[PDB]
């Protein structure tokens, strides 16, 4: 068995393990080691002695500086990727191999790049010097032509570094160039000149527009902006991405682009570009643009009634997403967005942090092929008659739910003051597949005509508000609606001084997920129960199942009998104490997946687990259950997973493991186990214990045998495995033990 | 005195006690034994207590078996509380001296002339809660409450009644009726109640809303039929309750003998038309208080507000309050028959989703007080039985805001930056609220040029920015400021965070910093204010703060020359330098280091404080005290040091501080008291401390009877933790 790290080209993860120093009993024939977030503090020409195999390894945050002798690599010569991030590392360390062609040395507090350090190093392909001498500093001293040896360089960041000017004497192979924050005031047409194959030219930070950022935001003197140079940019033909944020621009020259034909993302945003957006001549230079970012350039203390788009936004024919977050405007007309509907690959429109209180929506079906309508945190109301490798200024996250996305047209309203759903509100509007209505405090008394001008939403999320759907009628006029998210719609169920009904579920032929989850429901009238022929998911959890099946009538035995396609069940964080014998064999039989945990269940009746014979997933993690069955096997034979972490399980019965052939993973971690039997101990290829109150003696003495003869089942976090008694034994793992 | 504490009315609220205690003394008038584990109430139970006036046993057990005449030995009884005892029927046996008879959250279901009949002399009875959802219907026994002559007051809410109870003494001044599931009103239900000033009648055919207690509507959303002449004889009424009576006309002919009528309630309905047209408005002169809340039509969102030109005619009114009508915009002409009237001081707009509103209108009324704008949209300018359930009885503005002038409350609503034109046209407005609004803005101080007479204001729940030197400074005669949950500007790493503006303020009083995480204040790094008494820097990150490694924040309060008060508590602080300690202000009279992680307090610092009488060290990890705080301190009166690592007291620490009055030693890690560590002391509290009761604790005991007038509250809960068999009973109950 392999220990500390786990072995899975092979690659070994020693990864938070309280590692102190580097082990040695990691085997020769492994390729890549991660000793990440460890407590090693040295790092010699032993550590990795007879290792040539390696050639990737990662040493990040350590401890938690770290201590490197001269050519403690050296040795190793197939090395090519050295990942040395949150070391505290004064300089370069000395003596590394020219085999390398990956080189990280972010976050450290290395204020000077010598030649004795890097220019050694000709192979090397990427190049990380990042958060190295930033708000310490004065200034990061840049060897001359210290990256002027590196010929076979395609990437170097050298962001967050106070640097002033951009470092003489660059690669003419540089591909990708990063320059963010480096307190670059000046630019000039010598800086770019011998980089002609740059993709990518990140000048983004530089005399920045400070907002919601993790890093110190220091403007630049009297609101300066970036001064580039009109030939600047002149040789830079194959640039595919310009990433010119924060540089409190208020002018673009479009000369800049006059050298750019392949030109696909550009990023523009938190500029004072609100002029440049009603009338820009650097639009007309954009041809092959994708991927435009023009978020945050509003005006301080500036609403307007309407955006201003320029004529010539119309030039932007390759144009697919179109980011125009934070102008901050009050209305939305047909004609303020009329250059944008001659263009044919637009499927994105970000509008998110606008404001907006009224939108003509009667604009959005006369678009071309959109695809997806983000409309989030604005102000319509109802219509009647860290980590530092992520960029800091694009969420790259998708805007909607790639789920929700993948029915079709998408319509994100979520968090606006839809307060109750208007009878005109989806009035001319496209043929909508995704609709999110979430934290929009909306309180309407669902009837089945609300949704009536967009009845093709097959997922629809109605999450964080108070809707009523008491009427059998409510959302039915959606009858392809398939996905369906009433998540934290809590006031309702909660209220004594309603009814409480769920018979609009039964009327549905396509829904196939349910999401309920706190909701707090603990009565139904005059709908005890619910039924679904078409559901296959549904998530029950936050709410008061514990109320429901005390019932002194026993009203509610058959609440989930109804669901007859039901594979999927989350019944996690209802306060069960107790679950009764009828109202568990009530339960659908073709179950596959059920989730019980987080609760406060002390019994288990494991003998109505005959009764399903599709159950492959048990979840009864965070309980108070004391015990387990001896005859698991007479009762369950389709049972793969099985999840018993943070119970009160103490002891295991008498042939367990020894009895469910289709088990493969089962979980019993966290737990009060002490000792584990020979009489208890296939099919099993995954096994937790970790943090139970082993007795290390001679009693598990049989488990480790166990252990040595069944290799196959793999145990995870060995560490975290802690002998509890004795006192001299404590601390260790239990496959230490002598 | 045990388990009860005397004050003459005896305190047993909250004891855990199983039985009624004999250990009460003769001279007692008061007794209060609610929340209590008792079940049995016999004779023998108050035997010997003739001085007795009020019995309270609410809540019983968390039910209550009473014996027949367990309470007819006692002669002076007036008033008894018997609430939520789940008793089957009205105890048999009750005295007839008896004025004030309460049987709320029991399971009565019958009120039998066996029970209240013989009581004559009961001026209060409430007999609500018994009969709801469960028994179909409340069984009234015919002319059961003729008898009672001297009634003024009967309660029969949230009773299955269905119909008004017949033969109703002529003595009744206030009647309540509210969910009784009364469908239908008739003249002869209240004929001869000519001494009636309060009418209940809410809930019957309600409009169902945000509830604790189960709403049932009636068939089709029917409204309540009353009659015309049913209100026909009731003169002296100057109180109506119609709440939830899903009413969609108001028949003016009910308000034709009500001379007197002051409060009106008719929130929860259906009255947008009678709101609009109203002839029930010229039958209302001495009118005060009038509530149309919540009177909006489902899916109606109008243009404008329809008040009616009738309005003029209530000149007595004080308050008006027009909650939940829904409406997109407030014009000028919408409030034109209000402005006439002189006593109008409170307007309340709240719920209403105004997205605009012409601010103008507001200083053509003649004495506006309070305007109540909260839970709008506004955007930027360029349980208990024994309360009201349908009006709100808690004030709309704080009254420390409101006792400075004209109060504007515009919390809840869309402004997420101060517009110039924010407050223009505006009254002399010397309370503000902008609450919860989302606000970003950076503070320039221009941006309250308009209503510069603001006294108090509250700026919490927020994301403002206020790095300026000239912010919020055009406020020159600002006494109060709250900016108190403000994180979002402090919590994200890295851009100015100043507070030189305070220095500014020739008159600022109170500010409240709580909960916006200060860490790095540059620069200007210090708080300067001469005028200042009260600051809470609660909620914040002063830990990092004196952690400096080059002790630029050591002086953080040395400009505060007048502050009295200070609130350091939940600032994670593990321990405080002792020249940052020294730099606090010498005119500090309160201090509340509570809440924290400090292991330990230098105690000799507190001779640079000779004003100081209170010190709050509560909830945190101190393991000591001082042998010498006399020769610190001889100005501290009250020091509290509960939920603390104390486990020894040091010698001669009691006997030592003369000033010391009020001492909080409770939930420490205490075992035993010496004779050497036991004067002005009234208060001591050692409660949930694991005392060791065996013979060391038997010198504390001795000086608990020696010294009478230090009173320990909570004598009960001062249980002993070793060994197991004295484990369970108080350290005074033992042999
Ligand atoms: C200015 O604008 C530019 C764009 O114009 C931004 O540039 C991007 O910066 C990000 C962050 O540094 C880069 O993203 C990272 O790329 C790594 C390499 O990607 C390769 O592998 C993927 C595999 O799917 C390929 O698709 C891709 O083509 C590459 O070959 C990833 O490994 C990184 O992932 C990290 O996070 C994930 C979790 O999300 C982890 O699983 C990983 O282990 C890893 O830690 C990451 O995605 C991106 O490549 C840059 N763009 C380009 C085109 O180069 C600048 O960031 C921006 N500046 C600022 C300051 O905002
Ligand atoms: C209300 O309830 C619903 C239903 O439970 C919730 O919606 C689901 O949310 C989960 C996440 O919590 C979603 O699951 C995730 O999907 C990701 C994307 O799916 C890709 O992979 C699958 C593989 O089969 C492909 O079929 C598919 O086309 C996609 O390419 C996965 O990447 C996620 O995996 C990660 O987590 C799992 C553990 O859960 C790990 O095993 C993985 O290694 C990985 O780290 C994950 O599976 C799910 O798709 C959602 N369903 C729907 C219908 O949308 C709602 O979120 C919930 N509402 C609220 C408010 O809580
Ligand atoms: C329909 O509308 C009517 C009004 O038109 C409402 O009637 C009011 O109902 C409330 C609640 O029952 C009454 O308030 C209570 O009054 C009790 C008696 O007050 C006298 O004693 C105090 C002593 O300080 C005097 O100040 C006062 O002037 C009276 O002489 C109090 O005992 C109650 O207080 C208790 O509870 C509160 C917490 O709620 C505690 O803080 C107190 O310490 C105390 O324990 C309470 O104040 C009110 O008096 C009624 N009005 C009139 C004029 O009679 C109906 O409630 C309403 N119906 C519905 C269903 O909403
Ligand atoms: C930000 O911080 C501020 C300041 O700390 C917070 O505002 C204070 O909030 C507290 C409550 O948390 C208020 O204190 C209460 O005041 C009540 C009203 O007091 C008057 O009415 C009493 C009626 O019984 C009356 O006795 C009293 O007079 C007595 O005052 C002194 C009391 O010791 C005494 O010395 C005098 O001689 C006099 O007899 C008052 O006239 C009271 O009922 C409560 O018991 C409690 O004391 C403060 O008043 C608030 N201060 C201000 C300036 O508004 C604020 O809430 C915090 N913000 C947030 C969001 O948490
Ligand atoms: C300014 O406006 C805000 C918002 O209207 C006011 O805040 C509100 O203040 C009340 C009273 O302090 C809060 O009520 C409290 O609720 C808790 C929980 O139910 C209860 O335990 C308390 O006894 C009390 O009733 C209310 O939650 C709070 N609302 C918000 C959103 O914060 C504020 O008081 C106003 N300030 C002034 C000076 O008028
Ligand atoms: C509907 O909109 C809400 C709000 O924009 C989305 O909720 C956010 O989801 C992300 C990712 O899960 C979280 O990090 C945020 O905290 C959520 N915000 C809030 C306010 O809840 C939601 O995911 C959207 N749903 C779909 C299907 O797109
Ligand atoms: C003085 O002028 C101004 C000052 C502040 C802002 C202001 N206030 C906000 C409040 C909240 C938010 C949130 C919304 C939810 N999501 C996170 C951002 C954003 C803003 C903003 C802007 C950034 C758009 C605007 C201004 O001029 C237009
Ligand atoms: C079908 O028609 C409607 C259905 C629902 C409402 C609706 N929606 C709300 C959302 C939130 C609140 C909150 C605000 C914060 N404070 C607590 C009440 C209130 C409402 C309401 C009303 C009660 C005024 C309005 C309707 O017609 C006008
Ligand atoms: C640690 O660094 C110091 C630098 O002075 C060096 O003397 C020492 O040998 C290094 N290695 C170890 C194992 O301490
Ligand atoms: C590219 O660089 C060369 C040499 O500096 C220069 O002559 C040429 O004008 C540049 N190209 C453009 C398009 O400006
Ligand atoms: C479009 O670009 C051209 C570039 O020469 C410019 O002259 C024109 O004014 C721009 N259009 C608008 C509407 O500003
Ligand atoms: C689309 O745009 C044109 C103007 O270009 C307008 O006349 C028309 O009404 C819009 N809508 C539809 C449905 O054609
Ligand atoms: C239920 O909806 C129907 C139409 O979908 C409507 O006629 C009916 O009034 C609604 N029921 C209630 C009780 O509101
Ligand atoms: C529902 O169950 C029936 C059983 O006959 C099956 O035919 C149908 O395909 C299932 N539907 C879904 C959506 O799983
Ligand atoms: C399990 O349930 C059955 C009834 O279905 C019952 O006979 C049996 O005793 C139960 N077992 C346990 C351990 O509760
Ligand atoms: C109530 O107390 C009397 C005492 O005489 C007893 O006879 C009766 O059974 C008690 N009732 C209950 C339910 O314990
Ligand atoms: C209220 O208005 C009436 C008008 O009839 C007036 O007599 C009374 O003095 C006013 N109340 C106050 C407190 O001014
Ligand atoms: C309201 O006051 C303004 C002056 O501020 C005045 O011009 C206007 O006529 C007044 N309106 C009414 C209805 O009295
Ligand atoms: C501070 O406020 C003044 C006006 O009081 C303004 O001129 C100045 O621009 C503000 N400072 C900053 C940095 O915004
Ligand atoms: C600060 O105080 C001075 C003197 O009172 C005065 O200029 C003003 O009140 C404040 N300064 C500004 C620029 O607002
Ligand atoms: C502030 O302190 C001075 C000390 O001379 C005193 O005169 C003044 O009255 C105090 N002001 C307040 C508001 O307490
Ligand atoms: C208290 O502070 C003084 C300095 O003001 C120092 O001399 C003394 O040792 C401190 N006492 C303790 C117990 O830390």
């Known amino acids: 068995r392999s220990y500390p790290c786990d072995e899975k080209s092979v690659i070994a993860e020693c990864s938070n393990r309280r590692l102190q120093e580097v082990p040695q009993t990691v085997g020769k024939y492994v390729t890549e080691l991660d000793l990440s977030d460890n407590f090693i503090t040295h790092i010699t020409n032993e550590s990795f002695q007879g290792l040539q195999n390696l050639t990737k390894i990662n040493l990040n945050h350590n401890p938690n500086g770290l201590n490197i002798t001269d050519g403690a690599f050296l040795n190793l010569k197939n090395l090519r990727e050295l990942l040395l991030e949150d070391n505290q590392l004064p300089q370069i360390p000395s003596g590394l191999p020219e ?27 990427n190049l990380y010097l990042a958060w190295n001498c930033y708000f310490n500093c004065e200034k990061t001293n840049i060897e001359d032509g210290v990256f ?21 004497k660059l690669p003419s192979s540089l591909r990708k160039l990063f320059l963010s924050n480096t307190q670059i005031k000046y630019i000039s047409e ?5 980089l002609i194959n740059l993709t990518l030219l990140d000048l983004s930070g530089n005399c920045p527009r400070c907002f919601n950022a993790p890093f110190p935001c220091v403007p630049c003197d009297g609101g300066a902006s970036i001064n580039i140079d009109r030939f600047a940019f002149q040789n830079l033909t194959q640039l595919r991405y310009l990433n010119l944020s924060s540089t409190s621009l208020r002018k673009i020259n479009a000369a ?68 125009l977050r934070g102008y901050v405007f009050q209305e939305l007309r047909e004609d303020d967005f009329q250059p944008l509907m001659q263009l044919p690959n637009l499927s994105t429109i970000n509008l998110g942090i606008n404001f907006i209180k009224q939108i003509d929506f009667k604009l959005f079906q006369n678009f071309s092929n959109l695809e997806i309508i983000y409309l989030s945190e604005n102000r319509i109301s109802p219509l009647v008659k860290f ?33 109750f759903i208007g009878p005109n509100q989806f009035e001319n509007l496209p043929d909508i597949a995704c609709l999110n209505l979430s934290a929009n405090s909306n309180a309407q008394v669902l009837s089945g005509t609300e949704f009536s001008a967009i009845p093709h939403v097959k997922y629809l999320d109605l999450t964080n508000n108070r809707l009523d759907f008491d009427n059998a009628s409510a959302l039915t006029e959606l009858s392809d609606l398939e996905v369906l998210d009433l998540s934290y719609n809590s006031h309702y169920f909660r209220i004594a001084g309603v009814t409480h009904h769920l018979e609009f579920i039964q009327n549905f032929t396509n829904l196939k997920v ?63 104490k107790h679950i009764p014998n009828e109202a568990f064999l009530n339960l659908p039989a073709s179950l596959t997946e059920l989730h019980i945990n987080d609760n406060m269940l002390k019994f288990f009746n494991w003998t109505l687990l005959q009764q399903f014979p599709r159950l492959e997933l048990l979840d009864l993690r ?102 509890a008694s004795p006192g001299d034994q404590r601390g260790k793992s239990i496959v230490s033990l002598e």
Request: with cysteine; net charge neutral.
């Open 190 to 194: 010598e800086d770019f000149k011998g």
């Open 514 to 576: 349910l999401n309920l989850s706190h909701n707090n429901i603990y009565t139904l009238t005059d709908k005890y129960n619910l039924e679904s022929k078409s559901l296959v998911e549904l998530v029950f959890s936050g709410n008061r199942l514990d109320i429901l099946w005390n019932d002194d009538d026993n009203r509610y035995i058959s609440i989930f009998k109804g669901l007859k396609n039901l594979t999927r069940l989350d019944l996690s964080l209802n306060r069960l």
């Open 622 to 723: 965070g309980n108070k259950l004391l015990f387990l069955t001896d005859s698991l096997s007479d009762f369950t034979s389709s049972l793969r997973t099985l999840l018993l972490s943070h119970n009160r399980i103490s002891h295991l019965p008498s042939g367990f493991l020894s009895e469910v052939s289709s088990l493969k993973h089962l979980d019993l971690s966290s737990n009060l186990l002490k000792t584990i039997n020979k009489s208890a101990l296939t099919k099993l290829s995954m096994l937790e214990l970790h943090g139970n109150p082993f007795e290390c003696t001679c009693d598990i003495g049989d488990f480790r045998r166990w252990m040595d003869e069944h290799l196959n089942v793999k145990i995870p976090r060995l560490v975290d495995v802690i002998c």
């Open 387 to 419: 980590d530092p490798h992520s960029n800091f200024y694009h969420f790259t996250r998708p805007l909607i739910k790639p789920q929700c996305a993948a029915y079709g047209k998408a319509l994100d309203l979520s968090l606006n003051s839809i307060f």
């Open 148 to 168: 002027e040896t590196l010929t076979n360089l395609e990437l170097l960041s050298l962001s967050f570094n106070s640097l002033s000017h951009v470092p003489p």
């Open 256 to 323: 800049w682009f006059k050298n750019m034909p392949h030109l696909k993302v550009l990023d523009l945003e938190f500029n004072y570009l609100v002029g440049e957006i009603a009338s820009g001549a650097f639009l007309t230079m954009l041809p092959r643009l994708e991927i435009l970012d023009l978020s945050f350039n509003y005006i301080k203390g500036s609403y307007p009634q309407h955006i201003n788009i320029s004529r010539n936004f119309s030039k932007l024919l390759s144009l697919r997403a179109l980011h």
């Open 99 to 125: 085999s390398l062609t990956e080189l990280s040395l972010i976050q450290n507090n290395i204020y000077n790049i010598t030649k004795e350090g890097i220019s050694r190093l000709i192979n090397l392909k």
